[PDB]
Symmetry: C3
Subunit: 419 residues, 3 copies
């Protein structure tokens, strides 16, 4: 299942065995709540003034990450909202949602949307008010809460709450939206992840109807191989401080096979791991040639120019990986690995080393205690000469950030042909 | 209204037609809740123990962004809190808020604050408890909720909720605070934005009074012209990879005319757009000469030194603008623009191009789907030779970040006079 | 108590007088809720269907910062969760929590955990349901709220709410967990800070038991001296623009004495100040030699290589410190300090200056108004020649980021021996 390789020569590790789930698109749906135009008994009198005020307010209401592009997260959802402001467009919805709650309406600008009437307060208030109290206070409370979410979030919320869309409604919404059966089961078995990648956009109150758009994720890439790249500073370990040179692979992040290429997510926080399934958003990704994976096995390969940064700053630190820990120990720092019940079992030397989570519960670098992940899986240590040893410190470029193996090699050549 | 120009020569676009609303200052107000010192009937017995415990806990309680300065967001509000800890200062408030709820108190350190008694539980509990239940459970619930917000936020909350300050109270607070009529209407028509720029600071419980300060935004700059600058990487498109050079304008962000100068907001996320009104915070801004706008029309102009970064990293991406999309297509990437109902309508060539939101619903760069904003407005394409063609790649500085047109020109000159 | 020194020569200031409180480790505890397997009267009928649905969903559910390492924040807590999925492990807990609510269970993998039964709905529903309503609706509400938190957060919450763990339970939990009496009082007097550094991890529903792990902070470093370093750009102030050179100390952040070394926190936002106590997390820290403090008194000292960045970008800004304000005024910018009731009292000249919070309420740099902190304490102005005057602009490296005094001196020497 989940496996991990560590590369001694580049101070990096790769975790594989993951399956993709990439948000590639959005499904937009119009959620409606029907309202009443009103203008043990006392229990409703105070719950009815709660109502009037909610409507009152609802109306008053209306390393490599820098290489990423810039999207507009809710542009699709807002595009649907602008349509519902057209005249007769709200009444078209109101009409279709007459004898049923779930209906697909064709909107006037060539947009077919799944519309859902999730609460019928109009039918409730006009039939009952003008046991019963129990239903009012509960249906009303949902209205108050949807209102609260929208007012402290300026009409745009995420993750989409159970108030905006109940588990019942969401699951049904998922089942009725037209996607593959794989997508349907994936979404159904991960509704909280779905909720976190969703948007709720307050749209309109007009003609006794409250409407908001829910923007749900389309996962157009499913079950392709994914892998995470961890990198840590690789430094020489000479005696005199300040005489050392350092190199870090800057291409750390999530990598997923996708449509003949590889999706790269430089900010691994924009991805959510569930056992062995990785949920990412393609908005936070670059599209690279699959040759990028060649940088793990051979960082000097002629097909892809592996990206690195350089410095003279040899501080110690650790990177906790999926199945172990990379340790970059430099200078006078104390770095150890421990077992929970027996204590220190490995003291690290200067340089960059690695330990697996088998038998190890924590790692210590200086004054920093890291707990390691205790997921089961196999680790492989790939011995190799640390590539930083291949450079003369006297002509090593000591502050490169957006750089690569070739860019450094050219800078060096310019400095050598020089002498 | 909203208009947009794209500049082919610098791979950038400018959206104009916006009106400012800058938070320049803070208004601090002391909000008080009066408490009781106590020590169908059973409904109050359990709601009264809710009360005692809330009081219990309330007492237990007490690119260019790096160029920004560093403020202390609630320094003004906390400065008022320290005054209420002085002896007799709480009783001064308690005294003025006797026969009315809304009063301006002069605090002992030369601070005139609008004070508001938003809930009188002391008068309620001592007159009623020592129909009725309905009022208790509702007034009490507000107390419990204010308490919850403060305990999970360590006494400082934002956005300021409806519990801290009701729509009623906030609107009235806005109307009574002494600012211009323009500010009053601006704040009143945008109370949720106001709420998001506000702070609630738990201050004190002493002498049967709960006091917290609400820190509200002063908008001292209103209705001046604003514009957003979008930039994207400009790269040469030579055949052999790694032989290319790239240049990005780094001065992207919001720009607002302000007091003879221009306020620049390098992190466009610190600004909130409402139709054509832009809410920014001057804490997240630099003050530049208005000559900075010369960089859009002529990036080689002699009055301002336009800021850029350089690299050799030609990855594709898109920037979704206000009225269209900038596309930076490089290497073997597939980049398209589509209409919702007809599909691909433009395939982009290598280099940096632009498409408007008229007729276009989405843009695709590699595996990344961007929806474009569907706001109405006019786009203008300004043809020009891409300036990256004006540089010899053999003497081009390939990793500059905090740089400019002149700094690069000097670095080149140093490399040319050399040879 | 709190004191501050400003260094004119390096445009930096140091705030001392603080006491540490570092999260060094985690305490994990298993919190259990016992459930019923069921399948004025009507009040319970609707509150009982609330129950069934909550269980339904609960089951469906299951500058220098770049130098930091990367941890896994809840690796310890999740490691305990995996144990409770073993067979008989839930029943071991269920067994010990029979005749009492608070018990220490030895888990099968050599982990002794404090286990807490915080709500007994099983005993309630099976004894009462199969005055009374008041208790049900209140105990049930807690269940619904724990459920809501977990569903919109995918089973991991922070800060840990009063629903996950009441003030009562938390205080008792703190008292029973085996730490020093200093830690116990520190945690007890700061429970909201404790809550913010805590994690709640949804673990399991099996055999009529709901279990989640609460991950609480261990403060292994307490009451050591702490100090905050503020830095601001130091630039020459020549007439012609673009002819100036700039230098910024990049080592700003929190510094705490710790186990013979100094813990450095480059992102001062990962630290929370309470009067004179500083709460930090060692995960967001580097371990440095105590010699790093030598950079404040003598930035040219031979024991530690003080870190700086260089540029040609002389923009004005201010840094609000603990007891005053650093002002970096350059070019044509208007920079002032004011008193609340008398207005402008100091106009700053070009260069980097400082003002204390005694008599000063605000500082203005360009269009940016900063309020200063009004904490009492002594400020000391240490006069010195600004070190940027010691460099020839013609051989000054104008874009260094990850650099230091020596690295710049070497780059200069390479440029001088050259000529
Ligand atoms: C906030 C901030 C401010 C200023 C700045 O530059 C950067 C970008 N940047 C640079 N600078 C690059 C590369 C070095 N120089 C190349 C000629 N020596 C100059 C341009 N080195 C960096 C390292 C090491 C880590 C993270 C970011 C880095 N970030």
């Amino acid at each position: 299942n989940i496996t991990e390789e560590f590369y001694q020569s580049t101070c990096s590790a790769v975790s594989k065995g993951y399956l993709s789930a990439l948000r590639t698109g959005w499904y937009t749906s119009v959620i409606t709540i029907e309202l009443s135009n009103i203008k043990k008994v006392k229990l409703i009198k105070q719950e009815l003034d709660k109502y009037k005020n909610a409507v009152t307010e609802l109306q008053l209401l209306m390393f490599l990450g820098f290489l990423l592009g810039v999207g507009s997260a809710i542009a699709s959802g807002v595009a649907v909202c602008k349509v519902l402001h057209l005249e007769g467009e709200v009444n078209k919805i109101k009409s279709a949602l007459l004898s049923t709650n779930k209906a697909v309406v064709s909107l006037s600008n060539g947009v077919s949307v799944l519309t859902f009437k999730v609460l019928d307060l109009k039918n409730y208030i006009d039939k009952q008010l003008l046991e019963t109290v129990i239903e009012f206070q509960q249906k009303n409370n949902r209205l108050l809460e949807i209102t609260r979410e929208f007012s402290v979030n300026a009409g745009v919320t995420t993750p989409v709450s159970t108030y905006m869309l109940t588990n019942s409604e969401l699951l049904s919404l998922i089942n009725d939206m037209p996607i593959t059966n794989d997508q349907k089961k994936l979404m159904s078995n991960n509704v909280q992840i779905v909720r976190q990648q969703s948007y709720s956009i307050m749209c309109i109150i007009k003609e006794e109807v409250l409407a908001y758009v829910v923007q749900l994720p389309l996962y157009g890439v499913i079950d392709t191989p994914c892998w995470k790249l961890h990198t840590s500073p690789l430094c020489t370990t000479n005696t005199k401080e300040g005489s050392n040179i350092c190199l870090t692979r800057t291409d750390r992040g999530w990598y997923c096979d996708n449509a003949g290429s590889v999706s790269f997510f430089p900010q691994a926080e924009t991805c959510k791991v569930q056992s062995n399934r990785v949920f990412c958003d393609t908005m936070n990704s670059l599209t690279l040639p699959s040759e990028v994976n060649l940088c793990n096995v051979d960082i000097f390969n002629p097909k892809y120019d592996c990206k690195i940064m350089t410095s003279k700053t040899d501080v110690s630190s650790s990177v906790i990986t999926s199945l172990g820990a990379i340790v970059s120990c430099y200078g006078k720092t104390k770095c150890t690995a421990s077992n929970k019940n027996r204590g220190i079992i490995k003291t690290f030397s200067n340089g960059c080393d690695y330990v697996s989570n088998k038998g190890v519960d924590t790692v210590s670098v200086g004054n920093t205690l890291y707990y390691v992940n205790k997921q089961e899986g196999k680790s492989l240590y790939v011995k190799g000469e640390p590539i930083i040893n291949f450079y003369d410190p006297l002509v090593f470029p000591s502050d490169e950030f957006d750089a690569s193996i070739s860019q450094v090699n050219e800078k060096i050549n310019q400095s050598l042909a020089f002498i």
